[PDB]
Amino acid sequence: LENVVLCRESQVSILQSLFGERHHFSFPSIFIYGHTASGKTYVTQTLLKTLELPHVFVNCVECFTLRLLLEQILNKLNHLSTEITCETFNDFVRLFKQVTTAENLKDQTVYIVLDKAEYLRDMEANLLPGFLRLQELADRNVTVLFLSEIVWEKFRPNTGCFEPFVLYFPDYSIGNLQKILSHDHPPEYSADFYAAYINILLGVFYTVCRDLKELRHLAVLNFPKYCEPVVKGEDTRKLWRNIEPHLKKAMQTVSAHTHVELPYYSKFILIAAYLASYNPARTDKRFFNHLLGPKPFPLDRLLAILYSIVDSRVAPTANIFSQITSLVTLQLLTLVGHDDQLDGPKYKCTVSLDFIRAIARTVNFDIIKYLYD
Amino acid sequence: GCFVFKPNEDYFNPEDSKLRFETYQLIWQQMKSENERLQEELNKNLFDNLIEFLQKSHSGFQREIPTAALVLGVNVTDHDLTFGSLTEALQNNVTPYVVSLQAKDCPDMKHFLQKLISQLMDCCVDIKSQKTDPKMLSKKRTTSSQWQSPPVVVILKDMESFATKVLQDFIIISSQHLHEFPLILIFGIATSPIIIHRLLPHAVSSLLCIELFQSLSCKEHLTTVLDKLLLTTQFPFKINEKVLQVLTNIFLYHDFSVQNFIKGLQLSLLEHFYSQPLSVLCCNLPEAKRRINFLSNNQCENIRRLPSFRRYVEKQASEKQVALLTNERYLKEETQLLLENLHVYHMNYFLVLRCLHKFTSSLPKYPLGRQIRELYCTCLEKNIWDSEEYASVLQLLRMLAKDELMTILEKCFKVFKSYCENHLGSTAKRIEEFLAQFQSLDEKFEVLRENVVNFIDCLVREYLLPPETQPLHEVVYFSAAHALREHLNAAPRIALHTALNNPYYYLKNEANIAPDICIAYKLHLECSRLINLVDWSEAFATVVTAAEKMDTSEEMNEIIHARFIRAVSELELLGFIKPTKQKTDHVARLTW
Amino acid sequence: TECLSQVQRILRERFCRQSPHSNLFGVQVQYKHLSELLKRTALHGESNSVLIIGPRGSGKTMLINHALKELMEIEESENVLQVHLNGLLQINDKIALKEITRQLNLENVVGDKVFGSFAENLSFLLEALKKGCPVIFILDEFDLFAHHKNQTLLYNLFDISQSAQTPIAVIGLTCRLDILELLEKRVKSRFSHRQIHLMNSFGFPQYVKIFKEQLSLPAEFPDKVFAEKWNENVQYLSEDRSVQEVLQKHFNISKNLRSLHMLLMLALNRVTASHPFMTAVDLMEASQLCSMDSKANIVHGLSVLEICLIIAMKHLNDIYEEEPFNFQMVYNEFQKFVQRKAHSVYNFEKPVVMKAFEHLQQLELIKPMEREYQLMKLLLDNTQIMNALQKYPNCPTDVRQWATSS
Amino acid sequence: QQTLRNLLSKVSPSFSAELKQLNQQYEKLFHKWMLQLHLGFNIVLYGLGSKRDLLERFRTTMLQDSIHVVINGFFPGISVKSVLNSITEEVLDHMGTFRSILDQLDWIVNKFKEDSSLELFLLIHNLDSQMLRGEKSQQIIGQLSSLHNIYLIASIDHLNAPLMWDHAKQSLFNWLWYETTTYSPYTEETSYENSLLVSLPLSSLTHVLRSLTPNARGIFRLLIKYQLDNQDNPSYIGLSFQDFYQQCREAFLVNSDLTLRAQLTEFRDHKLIRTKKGTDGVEYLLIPDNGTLTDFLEKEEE
Ligand SMILES: Nc1ncnc2c1ncn2[C@@H]1O[C@H](COP(=O)(O)OP(=O)(O)OP(=O)(O)O)[C@@H](O)[C@H]1O
Ligand SMILES: Nc1ncnc2c1ncn2[C@@H]1O[C@H](COP(=O)(O)OP(=O)(O)OP(=O)(O)O)[C@@H](O)[C@H]1O
């Protein structure tokens, strides 16, 4: 809540100017894209908190149906009663005229802030061009302030709409990522020294993730670990060269063991399903690139290679078929004919080769020259 | 076509049904109750670590959301029982706000939230004494303002069969505002924690706090329930080694579950109580002495005339044969001590079988039996000292004579020192007999000669094959393997192969008489590559032309074609030939 | 002062609310075609149903409300009971009937029986209105209206417009071109044809005049000296050839006359703090804040692991062309590039390389068409990536050598 | 079909005595089914010949007292909606809820836990067929039959018939598997399916039309119009899922991707939409003629 800017001042100021004072009209709709790191709700919430433009805030992650997205907008707006119910959209534009006729916001440009609008994209085809024209659909000094993860070019309805004014909130630059990744609040060191730690950590680490949230998390972990040998041992260079031996392994390490005990015929089932998925260009006849993935194959071929793999005392009982259905619910095999029938469709293999190697080796079987070579 | 008719108990069917059925209901209900307790005791080391972890991750709330991903086994058949026990333990020592989601009652998000708030509403309204999302938060804000604001936890039972869309949206909703409503979800991963990376993309997987728990790997679960349920002296109904071999095979090969095993033992006990008229006296020994003394005389002729007793007749003298043959009043006297000898053989059998289990589990590489299950198997399939496997133990046990063997003689002795007076009367007072051998363990030759007299006395005295050694053993033993196996686990793909290839039921048909349908399939697979229709109609017509002349042609072509089309709709219907669309016609060889 | 807040209040409304400014240019013959038709449908009982088509952002709603205001000014309020509909709100028939009930003041009589035949429904609405009488139907955004389940509030309006002969104009406002070909054949053969408008723009040297007549402070007087000062400044900016340079650049992307409102809207937002009379360079940066490249701002900000991955995907088009790839071929090309390189800074191990993919899927540069090694699709251009890799500020030399190799 | 079936049963099935005897072997095994079914098991019984008349003789000898919902599965009218509807009215003696399948499922579960000894048991002929099965469909039979007060008997005919039972779904109803053979030809299936020697007519489309939502009815209008409007183009190889998703979304008929995919797989059940994989790997959709597609939505709107 504290720092409104942390040097992103020009985008803040053009957005701050664009709102204007209360008694005159503003834009109908503003669309702000950017990366997920870039403060697109930190900047707009600490901008809107200062002037208290009387606003409603929503996430559309929360509202999975259309009725809740209208209900919370109307219910949060009338406080600035009972649940003022809207089943349909024309109910929202009807009840909107009564709600925004109060002295708090009769003249004031009400902002209906919509967050993470890419989840609104697949709500309906109605609601997005129905919300972009709200300044003259209901005519009550509104400005629907969008923000999103996604580019505007995909977001358009392909009929067209009121094209909103589009801002690009910039990504944080390198010296700006030195400054705004916690140059304020270092508790016990000098801010020179915490910036010296993170100025070393960041320049090494500015190639995997420029996300500010996780880098605040990683820095508030590996800074107190860096901190402890200074205040215990005692010179930034020496513990710079101590902190990078720990930083490489903490980079690499941010999945217990792959091996799962299975009943013995299910082991031989998915051994057979692997062996019929990964080299299967009618090479059944021989024994008895790889990179593209698993090729699908029918059930009767799997059953034939099952008979060749196992010792021959198998019978097709109800349990060996019921197990071969029950391997699919645990997502070790997949059906790729989605509805081709109950009769045996193509079942393609979906487990990685190391896991299959371990499953084959825990029952007496070395298979890699047998698998694709 | 589902026409309903409206209408507008002790029936079982000699073995007289009323005390038969109450004997059934007593034995099976007793076994099920002790089954559920010996489930809930083993899991206490697992989930009473869990109460510690959930207590620690709740109490430090003054950016994160805690998940404890259990790794339960591949058996989905008994995953309800561990979650019933875990719901009980978490409900008692932590909050009375515990809900569980099934992953079949919520395909998408509206059902998820509607079923979760209804389960939470009944769960809060009982122990205090709706499609909306933030009203759930208002429920937690109303319902628990106090008592350290207890954390409401959801139990996703299957992590796997959830779609990723609805689960991702719920985790971002719940992690968005857990200021009020602290939520600690515990999804039960069926495979291994690897797949929580697979089903959750990295943003939502970064949102949460993962701490994984093991679960009881399943072979040392069924060693406890096999060991406690049938290996004891206590339960009146034992089981044959072949029927047990059938039951424990379809555990360890196909199913890997324990609820199927207890269904298998349930079916064995039911079929035993149906089968034979001497099954009524499957009881403890005074309850046996209750109505051995009064009973119908034809069932006592059956207690004379079942084959193991007539072996006992074959080994005995004439002067008591002439009275014990027919008369009831002495036949009670000899059969009562025969049932006492049955209980005697069971009681001196199982204790030193457990002794031999400890003394053989101590060994390197363990050649006889891996575990306590299979020792029952090896001492009953072949005769044990006849077989090479106990020959291999006896060949092993000589030069193993060191302080490892003396130390584990001490340790095995200690665990059946607890079973010294838990046996509490042996049937030879074998506890203080073998303990009288086993009391010089504190004070290298003595381990060898003490070993010699101990295994020879033990194994040659009681450890032998139960049918021939003991008459009247039909009463406690139920044995029918391939009568039960087809009831429990059948094969229709082998039945159709047998009754379509060889439909010989009892006049000449084994290698042209009494099908229509086997004529159709057998003639289809006399031309064994693939087929077209008209020539197949002419070929079927040819072989039943042979049938007609081995007892006009145009009428015969009509009736042959009509019965052909009745046959070929079945041969499509039963999962063979699947119709070859848009061509002139053909049938496709779909099963070889 | 009085001037800055008054100019921004009076110019901002006609500027960005698309408020009714009285100057209308390019549309004089279409308007004049509309007025006598509206006067003879409104003044007399007969009902004719004109239809309007044009592009988005030009023409329609301004014309129909301007002609409506001028016709309302004539009396004998004439009792024309206008009923505004929109295509976006009233999606279905049941909402449409109660919406006509709402506009036409019907709930004095209760009418609380859903009737089966909806021609009796519409005839009842017009019937209780008629005994109580002209209506003018402005059916806006007709292209969403042409997706009814049964096309009732298309068709029954046309049948009543020929058959009931209560005074009616079904004035459709559309956006897509084929209003006839999309319309279903019983209605389109029934009564769709009354005389169809077509709407388009005009020439650039008059479009600079519509810039000046748009921007100039109106005949409304905030303070007449400040209007003379500022509209003279508008003309001085207008006669300068750099504003004419940026305005011709704006014509050849946008003939819209809505894009001009936004382009100038950012300019006037900049103006009131200092220099109230502004530069051509201020209109230049006002154009410049309106972006040209929506995807360079997405690709320019990405860290360089996503850069060498995205140019690996571009390289996956330049060998083994046109398949929707999976992860493994991307990993293979990235590894063959890093094994071409000597240094081991950028040989980042496999589980990190998935994190770049599941971040890059959220930008929808890559597309899903089995779970994490399948059939992923690239929707992009080479040349925007080739421009983006030189404008990357901390772009390393090895990914530059990757770009030059390609 | 009919003049082919006049000739059926003219003279001489070539054995009779062992067929009466092989069916007369199984009449001794019925009181076992009654006892085994009272304890909580469920009998599936498979076979090679017709055993549905055996189940009818079974219900005549031992089900004159109890409720039985004989669900045929061989004729194409029955899917599990009709099961739940008929069990709700004609067994519970009052109609139930109407909002969803899961609502009436949970509701029809709910009546049995409170009302002791109501003792209803259905029996199903031909539980595996083209219409009865399905993971939406078979689980409702499962979850319904898991209780103590419902005892289903089935018959599975297929060769791959226990492929639709994973372990969890198998433990809803405790199966034990009888073996039966009768050799009687399955006259009801072969009667009421089809005969090839003579596409789908108007009746089953009327039944699917009258058992579904009006929005699903609005959906197939769009699909049948895009099919009929391009019927004589041999390059039209069907709409994709995304084109159909946007053209169904613009007409407000459905909201999400998953709802349309579920509607597509339940309409892929009735064999009136066929998926085709092109060279993209994207599977386009085309259904099985043109003149029989004009008649419905000619008459569905005047
Ligand atoms: N300039 C800044 N100064 C301080 N903290 C910042 C700044 N920018 C971003 N943050 C961090 O980002 C958080 C706000 O996240 P942000 O505003 O990036 O969400 P968002 O952009 O709406 O997310 P998304 O784009 O994923 O919807 C703040 O809690 C803060 O931790
Ligand atoms: N000939 C013109 N005269 C005056 N203003 C015009 C003219 N052409 C376009 N405009 C302006 O362009 C915008 C057109 O808005 P209007 O809603 O009338 O048409 P539209 O936007 O194409 O309609 P829709 O909302 O269906 O797209 C308004 O700002 C209007 O002031």
Residue numbers in the entry:
A (entry chain E): 4 to 83, 91 to 244, 249 to 268, 295 to 328, 349 to 433
B (entry chain C): 9 to 16, 27 to 31, 37 to 85, 98 to 164, 193 to 506, 548 to 615, 625 to 664, 669 to 709
C (entry chain D): 14 to 89, 91 to 146, 152 to 388, 396 to 432
D (entry chain B): 269 to 466, 471 to 560, 562 to 575
What did the paper state?
The origin recognition complex (ORC), composed of Orc1–6, is a highly conserved heterohexameric complex, which plays a critical role in recognizing origin DNA and promoting helicase loading. Each of the Orc1–5 subunits bears an AAA+ or AAA+-like domain and an α-helical winged-helix domain (WHD). Among Orc1–5, Orc1, Orc4, and Orc5 each contains a functional AAA+ domain for nucleotide binding; in contrast, Orc2 and Orc3 only contain a RecA-like subdomain with no predicted ATPase activities. Away from DNA, metazoan ORC resides in an autoinhibited conformation with a closed and constricted central channel to preclude DNA binding.
ORC1 and ORC6 co-purified with ORC2 were in much lower amount when compared with other ORC subunits. With these general similarities, however, ORC2-WHD displays a very different conformation from all previously reported structures. The most significant contribution to this interface appears to be from the helix-turn-helix (HTH) motif (α3 and α4) of ORC2-WHD. The loop region of this HTH is positioned very close to the cleft between AAA+ domains of ORC4 and ORC5 with its Phe524 docked into a hydrophobic pocket formed by the residues from ORC4-RecA (Ile105, Leu163, His166) and ORC5-RecA (Ala135, Asn136). In addition, Arg521 and Asn527 of ORC2 form hydrogen bonds with Asp132 and Glu134 of ORC5, respectively. Moreover, most of the DNA binding motifs of ORC subunits, such as the initiation-specific motif (ISM) from RecA subdomain and the β-hairpin motif from WHD, are blocked by these interactions. In contrast, although DmORC structure also assumes an autoinhibited conformation, its central channel is not fully occupied by ORC2-WHD, leaving a hollow ring with a diameter of 10–14 Å.
